[PDB]
């Protein structure tokens, strides 16, 4: 799985296509996942805005 029911660790990077993708790590995981913006932004709407503001 790519959304593996873990807690968000970081938002490392992003890339805008037809969909916006966030490249995020999870807590304990060591791997980076591409996750569509919409999903992550409903799930963790605050750490996202943090990522784009700072």
């Amino acid at each position: 799985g790519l959304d593996r029911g873990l807690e968000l660790d970081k938002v490392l990077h992003c890339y805008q296509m037809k969909e916006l993708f966030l490249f995020v790590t999870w807590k304990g995981c060591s791997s980076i996942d591409a996750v569509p913006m919409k999903y992550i932004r409903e799930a963790y709407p605050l750490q996202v805005i943090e990522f784009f503001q700072s």
Partner: protein, 41 residues
């Protein structure tokens, strides 16, 4: 940032899976893939 290319590819593969290959022509996919690479840069 000093991310390893295996991780970048794992991401690209997740991207292809989310959108679906049939979503674009290969020309399109390539242009975006080249953008995806210069992205980390």
């Amino acid at each position: 940032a000093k991310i390893r290319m295996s991780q970048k590819l794992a991401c690209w593969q997740q991207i292809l899976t989310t959108l679906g290959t049939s979503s674009m022509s290969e020309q399109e996919w390539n242009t975006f893939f080249r953008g995806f690479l210069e992205s980390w840069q």
